[PDB]
């Protein structure tokens, strides 16, 4: 169960004038922060969201995000004007890090334009992606001339980001290592043809996302189980569905088993 910090940003430019920049942070599966265009700050969503930072240290970071939001919009509007780019612009940034035992850490800063990867931060500078729409190289030229921004991104990713993750893990063990027991139930599925009929397995309300779901006739699991996506609940937890088509006869006296962290060894067994 990995806990990387993913700082996600959505910057939408409709016109040369209309602009909206919004963000959010995830410590693994959990959403830790919110960044609304309307607000002058990054909203802390959990009682441990500030990590082991002081209010002043947290204010220093708050300042970096205000200047960055302002500057990023100014810089995009300038690049559009310069590089002659049609104004419905969709820019996305994904940054953060994941810390591992032995003080080891890997960081990243990726930028996408119109849903496609254009550049990223690699060590000390900005590098374009393999499919570089050429204007990106002109952008890189300009961007890499700012040794202050490059020095500041290194500080944030190589220094402050691992510090923030380590602080958050220490602060929120209570909610991060928490477990919530799910609830499973049997349901009737639609017939894809005549004799054939698909069977559905429902599991909902488990907090730590890693889970294993499989259909079984006994001690041997049955191959043909097509599970859906692990869909989220607003109620913090997750929901999962699993479909299996049978020739009607291979449905009588059917069993099921679901393995999860919450259940104290004994797996939830569902029967007809």
């Amino acid at each position: 169960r990995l806990f990387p910090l993913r700082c996600l940003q959505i910057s939408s430019f409709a016109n040369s004038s209309w602009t909206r920049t919004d963000g959010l942070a995830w410590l693994g599966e959990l959403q830790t922060h919110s960044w609304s265009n309307d607000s002058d700050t990054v909203r802390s969503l959990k009682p441990w969201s500030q990590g082991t930072f002081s209010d002043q240290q947290w204010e220093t970071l708050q300042h970096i995000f205000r200047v960055y939001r302002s500057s990023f919009t100014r810089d995009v509007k300038e690049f559009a004007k310069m590089l002659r780019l049609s104004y419905p612009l969709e820019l996305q940034v994904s940054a953060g890090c994941e810390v591992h035992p032995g003080n080891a850490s890997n960081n990243f800063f990726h930028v996408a334009f119109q849903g496609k990867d254009i550049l990223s931060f690699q060590g000390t500078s900005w590098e374009p992606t393999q499919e570089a729409p050429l204007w990106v190289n002109l952008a890189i030229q300009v961007l890499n001339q700012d040794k202050w921004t490059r020095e500041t991104v290194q500080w944030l990713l190589n220094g402050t980001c691992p510090q923030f993750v380590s602080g958050l893990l220490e602060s929120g063990k209570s909610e991060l290592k928490k477990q919530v027991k799910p609830k499973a139930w049997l349901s009737r599925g639609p017939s894809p043809g005549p004799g054939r009929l698909l069977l559905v397995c429902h599991v909902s309300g488990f907090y730590p996302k890693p889970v294993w779901v499989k259909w079984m006739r006994g001690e041997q699991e049955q191959q043909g189980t097509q599970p859906g996506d692990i869909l989220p609940n607003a109620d913090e937890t997750w929901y999962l569905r699993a479909t299996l088509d049978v020739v009607a006869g291979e449905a009588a006296g059917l069993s099921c088993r679901v393995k999860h962290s919450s259940l104290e060894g004994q797996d939830i067994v569902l029967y007809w």
Partner: T-cell receptor
Amino acid sequence: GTKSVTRPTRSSAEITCDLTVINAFYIHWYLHQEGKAPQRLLYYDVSNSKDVLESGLSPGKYYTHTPRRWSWILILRNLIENDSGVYYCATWDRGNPKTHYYKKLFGSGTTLVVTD
Amino acid sequence: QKVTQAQSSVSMPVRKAVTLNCLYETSWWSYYIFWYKQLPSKEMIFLIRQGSDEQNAKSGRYSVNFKKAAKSVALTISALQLEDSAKYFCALGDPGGLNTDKLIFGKGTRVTVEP
């Protein structure tokens, strides 16, 4: 060169900033008392005209006045003996040697002497 | 956040070198150290900046010997001049890369350049 401002207790002093900052964002005020380490008391956010005070300092005590552009004045109310010292204003500049990084540039300093 | 400069006074002859020791405490994984020079006129002059993730800094006759593990930033003035006699302050940034940041200073060391 360093100035001096002599004032009686229970009165107020005006420490004028020695720096000329063309694109000022933040003006920091430091107090250096003989034998102690220089410490910043507050900084003034030029854009939002706001004083940000260090923890432990009472609001009202310090106020950065800006009578005009590129001019800053630190006003101290209710002077006492412990207010005496050398007062500097500062900015992150990059600079006389012109570097990629900012270094903190300090004014000449104003020596506050609180008599009685 | 704390900065200590154990040396109150130091005397060294002209043309020789002097190592001004400093020990700090920081609540930042990545920070910057700055060395300042105070003249008898109370004027504060910036000499050199260090920085945790950087190599040992050198700017003219100023050189920083940065031992990150022990948290030491010993400044060395190599070919002393008479004009070098002043109060040298060691400042730790909080963190020292943003225009809102503060500097945490040591109490200062006074160098007395012997003619």
